[PDB]
């Protein structure tokens, strides 16, 4: 239900401005939730434990991944689609049991 | 008060003014209360607090 | 507290209560209606016809100058008895609350219902008055409705407007009773009637 991101370039501070600027559209369509996994200082993932989160004062959270559809459209040219799948956007906390 | 539509509880009948639905307790605390009059005693005891 | 026969008789104490309790039209009447009467001596209500021709046989005003719009008020007999009012007091209260602008015709004392016919006389000397612009030019039935709301919701037949419900009772303790000294030297508490 979120509105799609619609763009239009406005290079009004420079000379030779193109009358038909290129445009972008961004859409979010899919949500993937994984298991609660903690990344350490070296970046190695490991499945966190609620006892481990209690002892290390960590937050029992799981990362969320989103699929991004990016359409690049030029006035007078065919738009092209790009899929940025499994894009990490943040960790949501997980309630136990 | 009639919290429901003309009823203090759904276990009574509408437009009933008898002492069972009114809030009168016919039993002692030694004998034990019915659940409706125990709820009415809760109604009475909340007002003091 | 009361003195004399009012403190010992319930009827005079109730007459005191009628002089103290706020009695508007809301506490005395049954219903109101607004009629159109083209012929005052040949009105649409047949039950009025037995006495309205009595009132217009020797009228105090020209019947051709009165307005065709009539205000018919039917009163309640039980509240009329409870407030101990007579009808001539109500007619006098109408005539002093509205002046000469309204004519009041009231029913008999032993009728089945108390019927009131209130009319307005068309003041032809005031119809030529100038300085009348954007002042909500007002129709006669609408004027009858607004003065009907005025005599239903604002005026007082008897009592005090600042006094609401009034109760009559006898005290049962020796605090609101009248304590007097007898000829023997004892203290006697008399439970006189009193108002709250």
């Amino acid at each position: 239900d979120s509105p799609a991101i619609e763009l239009q370039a406005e290079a009004q501070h420079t000379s030779g401005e193109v009358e038909t600027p290129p445009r972008f559209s961004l859409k979010f369509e899919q949500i993937y939730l994984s298991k609660p996994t903690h990344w350490e200082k070296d970046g190695s993932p490991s499945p966190m434990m609620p006892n481990e989160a209690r002892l290390r004062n960590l937050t029992y959270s799981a990362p969320l991944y989103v699929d991004i559809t990016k359409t690049k459209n030029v006035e007078g040219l065919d738009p092209v689609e790009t899929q940025h799948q499994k894009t990490f956007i943040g960790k949501i906390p997980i309630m136990l049991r | 008060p009639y919290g429901f539509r003309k009823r203090t509880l759904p276990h009574f009948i509408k437009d009933d003014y008898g002492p069972e639905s009114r809030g009168f307790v016919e039993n002692s605390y030694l004998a034990g209360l019915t659940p409706s009059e125990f709820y009415f005693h809760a109604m009475g005891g909340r007002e003091g607090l | 507290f009361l003195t004399g026969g009012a403190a010992r008789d319930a009827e005079k104490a109730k007459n005191v209560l009628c002089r103290l309790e706020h009695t508007t039209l809301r506490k005395v009447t049954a219903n109101t209606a607004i009629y159109y009467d083209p012929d005052p001596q040949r009105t649409v209500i047949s039950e009025d016809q037995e006495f309205v021709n009595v009132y217009y046989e020797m009228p105090d005003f020209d019947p051709t100058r009165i307005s065709p719009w009539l205000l018919r008020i039917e009163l309640d007999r039980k509240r009329m008895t409870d407030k101990k009012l007579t009808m001539e007091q109500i007619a006098e209260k109408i005539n002093v609350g509205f002046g000469e602008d309204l004519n009041c015709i009231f029913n008999d004392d032993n009728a089945d219902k108390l019927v009131l016919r209130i009319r307005i006389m068309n003041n032809e000397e005031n119809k030529f008055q100038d300085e009348d612009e954007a002042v909500d030019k007002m129709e006669d039935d609408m004027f009858l409705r607004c003065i009907e709301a005025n005599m239903l919701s604002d005026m007082t037949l008897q009592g005090i407007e600042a006094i609401g419900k009034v109760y009559m009772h006898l005290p049962q303790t020796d605090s609101k009773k009248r304590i007097v000294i007898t000829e023997t030297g004892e203290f006697k508490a008399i439970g006189e009637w009193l108002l709250e």
Partner: protein
């Protein structure tokens, strides 16, 4: 008796009372339109302070299909002589000062409502 209002046959507005003097007859006319008609009655506004409610027509006859309502089997129906009836008090702001019981016949074909 009591009277209501009438709607215009041309623009469906109110038809306000009006008095003209060439025929001594009230005309119920249109104020945004040019429609008018004669007066069947003579009242324009009746206000009742102590109004007599006919609440027997006010109560829905479907309340026989209500498990929360009381039932009686001694007061017979005046219409179809049904022994079973549903008695309840009215809901208006005038009837709580009387403690008046209102009886509805439980027969689906009769549905008589009365007061004892």
């Amino acid at each position: 008796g009591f009277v209501g209002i009438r709607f215009c046959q041309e623009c469906n507005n109110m038809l306000y009372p009006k008095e003209d003097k060439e025929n001594k007859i009230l005309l119920y006319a249109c104020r945004n339109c040019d429609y008018k008609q004669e007066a069947d009655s003579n009242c324009i506004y009746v206000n009742k302070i102590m109004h007599e409610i006919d609440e027997l027509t006010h109560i829905v006859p479907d309340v026989i299909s209500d498990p929360t309502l009381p039932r009686t089997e001694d007061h017979a129906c005046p219409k179809c002589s049904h022994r079973e009836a549903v008695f309840f008090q009215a809901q208006t702001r005038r009837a709580e000062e009387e403690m008046r019981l209102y009886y509805v016949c439980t027969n689906q074909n009769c549905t008589h409502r009365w007061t004892e």
